[PDB]
From a paper:
[name] (GTOV), first recognized in 1989, is the etiological agent of Venezuelan hemorrhagic fever. As a result of the rapid onset and high mortality rates associated with infection (∼23%), GTOV is classified as a high-priority category A biothreat agent. Together with other South American HF arenaviruses, such as Machupo virus (MACV), Junin virus (JUNV), and Sabia virus (SABV), GTOV belongs to the Tacaribe complex of the New World clade of the Arenaviridae family. The GTOV genome encodes two highly glycosylated glycoproteins which facilitate host cell attachment (GP1) and fusion ([name]). Upon acidification during clatherin-mediated endocytosis, GP1 is released from the virion and [name] mediates fusion of the viral and host membranes.
We present here the first structure of a New World arenavirus fusion glycoprotein and show that [name] adopts an archetypal class I-type postfusion fold. Approximately 50 residues at the N terminus of the [name] ectodomain were removed to exclude the aggregation-inducing N-terminal hydrophobic fusion loop. To aid crystallogenesis, recombinant glycoprotein expression was performed in GlcNAc transferase I-deficient human embryonic kidney 293S (HEK 293S) cells, which traps glycosylation predominantly to a homogenous Man5GlcNAc2 glycoform. Each of the three [name] subunits in the asymmetric unit consists of three regions: a 45-amino-acid N-terminal α-helix (residues 301 to 346), a 50-amino-acid “T region” (residues 347 to 398; named in comparison with the Old World LCMV [name] structure), and a short C-terminal α-helix (residues 399 to 408). The N-terminal α-helix spans the entire length of the 85-Å-long molecule and connects to the C-terminal helix through the T region, which is composed of loops and a small α-helix (residues 358 to 364). The N- and C-terminal helices pack closely in an antiparallel arrangement, where each protomer associates to form a trimeric coiled coil. Our structure is in a postfusion conformation, with the N terminus (fusion loop region) and C terminus (transmembrane region) colocalized, consistent with the merger of the virion and host cell membranes. The crystal contained protein-glycan and glycan-glycan lattice contacts, which facilitated visualization of carbohydrate chains from three out of the five N-linked glycosylation sites on [name]. The T region also contains a 10-amino-acid stretch (residues 365 to 375) which is fully ordered in one protomer and disordered in the second and third. However, superposition of equivalent GTOV and LCMV protomers leads to a greater structural variation between the two structures (a 2.2-Å root mean square deviation [RMSD] over 96 Cα residues) than expected between two structures with 50% sequence identity (an ∼1.0-Å RMSD).
Numbering used by the authors:
A (entry chain C): 295 to 358, 369 to 406
B (entry chain B): 293 to 407
C (entry chain A): 293 to 356, 367 to 403
């Protein structure tokens, strides 16, 4: 019983570490991409005489370039990962340990 | 007894992995689409500032190395790395094991057979 | 019997996390490499347009839209994402031990 709780605990901790790693990775990538968006918009605004180029406005990636896709609405918001199940597993471990009243 | 509690613990872990898979898929796909939009705009810029096309494209050996140099790369501007071949395809996370876990739960419950 | 079935359930979860780790590493590394290529091309553009020399580089730190100052530099390149398999490796070692019982 104790060995099986340990196996569950390993899996649960491995998932936590992966969640942390993915959160760190995505947030690092998101911030880097946002910096590229900002610089690309800054370039566009300073080669203003080249703005014969229109903005796409409503169109997305239907077409599997003729207009700008990136706007000040393109910035990615930080991706905060939901640890709801991991937190419930932590609470379940505390409970599992309590039923031990023998 | 205790068997049912251990199935519940497995179920929590399985569901947590499923949610993380979904979250990572959503994140990657969102990032991919945003990066593809940046590629498109950068290519569109390049095509309209034809007086900047004294700049050559990376002679695939250069390009392969830049994508394989498992570091923060030297890169110091030399030729174009981004082409219409740089677009990222959507990321499809393979819930292979989670789907098999769901099928394993149905089996575990059947193997309670005992009369 | 039920012990062997519970080890199999743990094994499924452990392998599912493994596969996800592999997938995320592949995805992030692919994204990182693509973003690094965009950084390089954007810097290459900046270096070949002397008419944009007026544009300053950002005074880094905190306090971060309105167009002003370069954010991307040769210090912006992302390093490859090393996905540690610490727990998975320990689980693999624990399985070998469980089987010895
Ligand atoms: C991966 O997943 C796990 C699962 O949850 C996640 O969990 C983390 O677990 C670690 C282990 O403890 C947690 O670490 C703690 O973080 C505390 C947060 O403090 C922050 O803010 C501090 C404020 O600054 C002022 O106050 C501090 C004193 O509080 C003072 O020293 C400063 O000078 C300043 O006046 C800041 O200091 C702190 O920075 C760290 O480094 C400095 C450098 O020396 C040190 O002086 C600090 O004390 C601190 O260590 C940080 O930015 C932190 O306070 C805490 O430190 C004390 O308490 C812990 C116990 O709680 C003791 O073990 C430790 O020895 C210290 O006495 C400790 O560092 C972490 O917060 C958990 N995170 C979450 C989300 O729960 C991991 O983080 C995940 N990994 C990821 C995402 O990468
Ligand atoms: C990353 O991206 C995401 C994607 O959008 C982004 O999400 C947005 O987050 C912002 C907040 O940061 C959301 O907007 C805020 O909502 C606050 C909540 O107040 C609400 O209740 C008000 C009460 O009205 C009542 O009566 C009416 C009927 O008469 C009824 O319909 C209402 O439901 C309610 O019962 C309501 O008036 C108010 O309305 C605002 O928001 C709605 C959309 O939710 C919009 O349609 C309205 O036109 C109006 O803007 C709202 O429903 C609100 O207090 C807050 O206000 C800010 O601005 C005012 C000045 O305009 C300041 O005085 C105030 O202090 C706040 O600064 C703001 O509107 C927004 O809706 C989210 N987006 C979506 C799609 O939901 C994240 O934030 C991003 N991350 C960032 C930025 O870090
Ligand atoms: C980094 O990447 C870039 C990206 O491509 C790469 O650029 C290429 O550079 C190579 C040269 O190194 C280019 O190819 C060379 O072009 C030489 C020029 O000769 C031309 O004129 C010939 C005359 O024909 C006339 O009549 C015909 C109609 O009949 C008419 O169309 C012609 O325009 C012209 O009026 C013509 O025959 C010849 O054709 C070759 O090139 C074209 C493409 O330009 C191709 O479509 C043909 O099939 C044919 O290959 C050309 O237009 C040419 O002399 C040279 O030849 C080499 O090979 C022969 C043997 O086949 C050797 O005998 C000779 O000594 C040379 O070694 C070669 O073809 C290539 O076109 C560039 N790419 C592009 C898109 O333009 C850089 O080189 C890369 N950096 C590196 C490799 O370091
Ligand atoms: C991205 O990857 C590069 C590749 O290594 C990381 O660079 C490394 O950063 C460390 C941090 O200082 C350098 O260490 C230094 O070594 C000298 C040598 O004795 C020592 O005197 C210093 O006190 C320090 O220990 C390391 O040399 C350097 N390596 C290279 C090739 O640059 C970089 O930090 C990574 N960036 C990240 C993860 O954000
Ligand atoms: C993956 O994440 C998405 C993002 O919300 C979840 O979306 C929900 O999907 C359920 C399934 O029908 C809907 O009922 C909800 O209304 C959706 N929510 C939103 C905001 O769209 C999705 O369920 C997650 N995958 C899971 C839990 O398996
Ligand atoms: C993957 O993306 C590249 C980039 O353009 C594309 O050429 C290739 O066909 C894509 N693979 C697919 C859609 O299977
Ligand atoms: C990749 O997936 C396989 C499939 O189970 C797994 O055995 C292997 O350890 C994984 N590699 C990782 C997570 O680095
Ligand atoms: C950025 O490029 C310049 C140009 O030579 C170089 O001097 C500088 O050291 C580079 N930044 C690095 C290597 O971090």
């Amino acid at each position: 019983f104790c060995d099986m709780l340990r196996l569950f605990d390993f899996n649960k901790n491995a998932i936590e570490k992966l969640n942390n790693q993915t959160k760190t990775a995505v947030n690092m990538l998101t911030h880097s991409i946002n910096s590229l968006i900002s610089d690309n918009l800054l370039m566009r605004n300073k080669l203003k005489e080249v703005l014969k180029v229109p903005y796409c406005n409503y169109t997305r990636f239907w077409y599997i370039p003729r207009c700008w896709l990136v706007s000040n609405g393109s910035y990615l918001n930080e991706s905060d990962f939901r640890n709801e199940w991991i937190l419930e597993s932590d609470h379940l471990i505390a409970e599992m340990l309590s039923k031990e009243y023998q």
